[PDB]
Amino acid sequence: MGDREQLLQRARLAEQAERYDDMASAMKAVTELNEPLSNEDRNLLSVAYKNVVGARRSSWRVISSIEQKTMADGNEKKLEKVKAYREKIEKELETVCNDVLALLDKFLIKNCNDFQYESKVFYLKMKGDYYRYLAEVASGEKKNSVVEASEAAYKEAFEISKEHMQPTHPIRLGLALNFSVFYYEIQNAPEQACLLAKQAFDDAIAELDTLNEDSYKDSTLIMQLLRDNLTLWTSD
Template sequence: MGKRKRLAKRLSYVPRRSARENTFGKVTELNEPLSNEERNLLSVAYKNVVGARRSSWRVISSIEQKTSADGNEKKIEMVRAYREKIEKELEAVCQDVLSLLDNYLIKNCSETQYESKVFYLKMKGDYYRYLAEVATGEKRATVVESSEKAYSEAHEISKEHMQPTHPIRLGLALNYSVFYYEIQNAPEQACHLAKTAFDDAIAELDTLNEDSYKDSTLIMQLLRDNLTLWTSDQQDDDGGEGNN
């Protein structure tokens, strides 16, 4: 196993920020583009770390709402303090990733590395979206704008240089549409983007690479599931979370 691959796999076991920074520092010191496997390992490792915080934040926010209704000031303050602690941890992880993307991964992509460029810009959109989930006021407006900018750039590149059935292009469409639905509260745009991506992929199923068949069809199913959910929600005037 190569040095970078060993370092990348270590990330799965280093949830502490100092340990992640140390490991990533060693990865980036090599100053070479990451392989597809290394890129995926780093992405999954950070998604696991931030995913735990996102889940915790959702749970504690729900508890905070119920506690506020009870009117117990001491409990309200305790729950609020814990929510703020989780928010700081989540923000720290997101900033780690965004710094890595801007200062190394995106920066080091060549003009013809379209797949890597789309992959990293999608990640950038994702982590700004995660920040938007917990931000408020002007801070939220800023990260929402940054998220859309990254998604939009990735979307344009993917449409020009990648097959509609490519799993990275499909994954981008999935997350970009979730951004429109959950963050921008724009269900029509979300449904249009998801439906277009799904229909374009269906029309070119014969171009589907055997190696990526499983990944592509899974994402297509998630796009279809979201479309079904969102269409139903619009009809029922209910909210709903998409798959992302």
């Protein structure tokens, strides 16, 4: 019927067709109607941009790896062409990230009240994520800026999640995971990263026995990822 439901139908059709730029364009339009998102709406927004930015991040890593190998060989003429393509992909990646960040700051985080803890944590975790993707491709003072913005967002998300969410909550577990990944991959702080991931895993597993079947599947999937990272990270 209505216009918002029309945009949401577009977003789920696009998801089913694996047309994530269409999906992200639709969820962006939903957000800019300045009405809050339900739990399912937030997930459609997250799935859409995760896929759009993830395609760009994958492409960027491949071409940047080719760029480093071209520079080592000193093929200056080929390096200039690889660099131009890497920068093309990079600008797409940064625009996707800034689109998301604008939605979070102008709408989603902005319109949360202080008692919508799940919304706040969800949006602040996502702000941490998209600043972290910006950090992955930045260097120098540009990198330090988005790194500080990522950590600040993650930190506030985690304090709210600790104070208002059970250790088993998938969103709080997903935030601990991504925050520990931030420390390990972005900050090169393995001890901080392991300390965080291990605290999150131990806090969740003690209360896991109290979940219904469906809630247990969600939490354990994320806890297994925490456990895998901890094993990989301590082995170096």
